[PDB]
Amino acid sequence: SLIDPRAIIDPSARLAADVQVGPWSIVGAEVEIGEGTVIGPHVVLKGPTKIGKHNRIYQFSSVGEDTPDLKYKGEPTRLVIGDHNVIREGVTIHRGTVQDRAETTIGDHNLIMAYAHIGHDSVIGNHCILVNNTALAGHVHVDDWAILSGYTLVHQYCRIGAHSFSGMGSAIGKDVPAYVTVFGNPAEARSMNFEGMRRRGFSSEAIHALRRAYKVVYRQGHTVEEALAELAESAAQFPEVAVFRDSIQSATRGITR
Amino acid sequence: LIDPRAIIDPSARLAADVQVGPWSIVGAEVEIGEGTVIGPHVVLKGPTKIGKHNRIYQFSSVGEDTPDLKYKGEPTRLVIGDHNVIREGVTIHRGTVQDRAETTIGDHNLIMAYAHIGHDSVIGNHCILVNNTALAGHVHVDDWAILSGYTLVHQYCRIGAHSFSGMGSAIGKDVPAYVTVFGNPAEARSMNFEGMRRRGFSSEAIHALRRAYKVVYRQGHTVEEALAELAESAAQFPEVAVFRDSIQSATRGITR
Amino acid sequence: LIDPRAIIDPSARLAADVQVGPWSIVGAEVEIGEGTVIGPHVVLKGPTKIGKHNRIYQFSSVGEDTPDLKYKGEPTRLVIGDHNVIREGVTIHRGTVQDRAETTIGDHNLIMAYAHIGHDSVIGNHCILVNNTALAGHVHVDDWAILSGYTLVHQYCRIGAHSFSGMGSAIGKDVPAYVTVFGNPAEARSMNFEGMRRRGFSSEAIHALRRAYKVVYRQGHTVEEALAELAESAAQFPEVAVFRDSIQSATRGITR
Ligand SMILES: CCCCCCC[C@@H](O)CC(=O)O[C@H]1[C@H](O)[C@@H](CO)O[C@H](OP(=O)(O)OP(=O)(O)OC[C@H]2O[C@@H](n3ccc(=O)[nH]c3=O)[C@H](O)[C@@H]2O)[C@@H]1NC(C)=O
Numbered sequence A: 001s002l003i004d005p006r007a008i009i010d011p012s013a014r015l016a017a018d019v020q021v022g023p024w025s026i027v028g029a030e031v032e033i034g035e036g037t038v039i040g041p042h043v044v045l046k047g048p049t050k051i052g053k054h055n056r057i058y059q060f061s062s063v064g065e066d067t068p069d070l071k072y073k074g075e076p077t078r079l080v081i082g083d084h085n086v087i088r089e090g091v092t093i094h095r096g097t098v099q100d101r102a103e104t105t106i107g108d109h110n111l112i113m114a115y116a117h118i119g120h121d122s123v124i125g126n127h128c129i130l131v132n133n134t135a136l137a138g139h140v141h142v143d144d145w146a147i148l149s150g151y152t153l154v155h156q157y158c159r160i161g162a163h164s165f166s167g168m169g170s171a172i173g174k175d176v177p178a179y180v181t182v183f184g185n186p187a188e189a190r191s192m193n194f195e196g197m198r199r200r201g202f203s204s205e206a207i208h209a210l211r212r213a214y215k216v217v218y219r220q221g222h223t224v225e226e227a228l229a230e231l232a233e234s235a236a237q238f239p240e241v242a243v244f245r246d247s248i249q250s251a252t253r254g255i256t257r
Numbered sequence B, C: 001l002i003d004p005r006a007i008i009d010p011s012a013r014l015a016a017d018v019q020v021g022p023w024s025i026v027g028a029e030v031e032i033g034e035g036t037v038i039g040p041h042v043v044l045k046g047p048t049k050i051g052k053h054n055r056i057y058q059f060s061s062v063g064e065d066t067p068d069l070k071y072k073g074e075p076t077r078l079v080i081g082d083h084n085v086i087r088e089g090v091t092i093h094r095g096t097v098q099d100r101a102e103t104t105i106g107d108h109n110l111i112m113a114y115a116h117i118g119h120d121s122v123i124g125n126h127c128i129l130v131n132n133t134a135l136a137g138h139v140h141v142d143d144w145a146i147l148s149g150y151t152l153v154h155q156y157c158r159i160g161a162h163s164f165s166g167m168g169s170a171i172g173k174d175v176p177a178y179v180t181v182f183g184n185p186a187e188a189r190s191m192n193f194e195g196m197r198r199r200g201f202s203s204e205a206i207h208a209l210r211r212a213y214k215v216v217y218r219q220g221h222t223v224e225e226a227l228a229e230l231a232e233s234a235a236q237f238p239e240v241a242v243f244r245d246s247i248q249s250a251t252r253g254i255t256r
């Protein structure tokens, strides 16, 4: 079979047609799995959870477990995972809490490496890479294309901007703006992620605008509001700069300087 | 209650209402108390005593031998109390013959995914060890302390009651009670006022703790001096007494 | 010896006294040598060669494909020697065609829980990787090196023989032989005199190495100047020659 007979499938679970589930894995009550998704051996899936299409989940992962957050109380919170995602060895993904969104969400095309953690109520976009042991504490929003190097730690409620980059062992306590590169414990702003922008084919005009934007924010001594005003123009001209400006505007715990 | 795909050793002892999920191993000389819930894919090894109403999650290794190229299999122990939560992939090692010969965990502790509790460590009650917190060995964690994600604790260190580490802290020296530490290497920052409030500490006790911080950290005093200077406040406030005592017992220095 | 709940692919090759615990998978093209003990809940994938008298603990993934977006299904290898101990949850990945197409590990290595050995890394002999030590890829670790818990090693770096890293070190450049490093980012501190004594080095060799360290790290020389200055004691002392050679081979920077 596509479904190993040593696996355990709750009667209430709903598996699309070509789903593979390896030996000694558990697909629990109210778990929904979508077409082309391959579940490895030794995998614990718990619900209520919805996993889309063409995903890949490796051994020793715990996807859809209750958060150990002391506030959570057995409520029927959820987890939503999209399509084309890779979940590697021993990754842990917890479901949401009623105190927030009552949902934890992961989009599409994400690569989530071994022993990474995705805490309750987290929101991961698309095309993100979480390298080994990257941990998102809770209520963490990671926007499209971000890359978090191994053992990057993200404090609860922090937002990780689109196309951003973290060096290995970074400890992020504040919001990381879109395109920014951070390193260290505590994490510190270094520059922008030009390598990402290039691997992605951003235009030279956008890069140049991104580069001036950085200065306005980090190098000219403005308070954040002074900064946001000065970017109005370029944010009106360049969408890339608007994403940047927006990411700074939505910061609740401040920005990583 | 006890899944037939699990392997229960004949010398293992299970109290009533114990559950054991599939493909778990409850080895020789493991004793499990009443109400305890063990997940699937758990390895319990002994000699080990687990109390009541505990919950242990999948991929955990509880009661394993401390690593070594050597296969020295002494009868050292692990003792775990009641109402503890042990999450995914937690490693907990038994003690060493040279030392206490026992690793000890109290009650109402929360030990999050992939934390490690090294041989001969002692955890009290109401402690939280957030993800990937690692206790090297011979570590003593007193009541209500909180170690944030990826906190590393060097061997022989004492983590004081009600203390707090920020995420990714590397602790190489005793953390006095109530103290908050950050960084690698870890440094003292302030007192855990957030914790003290959540636990209903009196405003009087909190101000006295705040003042005691300065006596130890910001007035240039020696310790024999700080402690002499603390003696009176300690007598009035049992909370200050815990603090003073944590500092007095700091044999190989305090995190400054 | 081979538990009937384990899964052994027809193509695997196992030595006579190989033990395999329950719920382990020995996949296609895996070879296991005499006296090796595979625990329960182990995933082994190939092509992989495992030598003799090894110990692989539970929840380990040995011989998986690297998640490197560059790897594309090719049949790269992993070779592991003898007398190794691989603890709980260790991940070891096979090589890439972009490099050596092989991940390699020698003999007498102690690889502790949740450590990661990335694609194309090479490990020598008598090394100790403490809990959650992670080699990113294309890392070379030379004999007798000790990496303390949560040591991160950046891809392409070389860890020299008898070197030591403090816990939570983040290593981005090569670490010369014998050198001790600490912190994030990692920095050189002194020489692993423990290791030298522990390993029967003569007091004459030790003084020369101590002298060698001063030459490279304390006198304001350039690497080339420093290398030249060492030639003599390198000729006289093979221990020093290991030190000089590690610095020489430091293509892209030594840790300072
Ligand atoms: C990235 C590191 C490694 C990954 C760790 C992953 C952990 C999560 O899966 C689970 C988790 O820890 O949930 C917590 C939840 O994400 C948070 C917000 O909802 O709330 C809880 O943590 P905490 O109580 O610390 O959260 P707050 O954000 O409210 O804390 C306020 C601030 O005071 C600090 N604090 C907290 C307690 C204290 O005693 N002293 C403090 O200083 C704390 O650092 C924080 O900065 C929750 N804790 C508990 C035990 O319930």
Ligand SMILES: CCCCCCC[C@@H](O)CC(=O)O[C@H]1[C@H](O)[C@@H](CO)O[C@H](OP(=O)(O)OP(=O)(O)OC[C@H]2O[C@@H](n3ccc(=O)[nH]c3=O)[C@H](O)[C@@H]2O)[C@@H]1NC(C)=O
Binding pocket: A113, A129, A131, A132, A147, A149, A150, A151, A165, A168, A193, A195, A196, C066, C067, C068, C069, C070, C093, C116, C118, C119, C134, C135, C136, C137, C152, C153, C154, C155
């Ligand atoms: C140390 C503890 C952490 C655990 C790490 C273990 C992970 C590995 O098993 C898997 C892995 O990460 O493989 C990568 C492979 O080790 C590398 C070399 O071949 O190459 C690839 O990674 P990456 O492309 O990031 O590494 P490079 O060596 O090519 O990096 C180039 C430089 O660009 C930087 N960079 C990268 C991406 C970006 O968006 N912005 C950047 O600045 C990066 O920091 C680095 O300095 C591979 N990446 C991917 C996602 O495929």
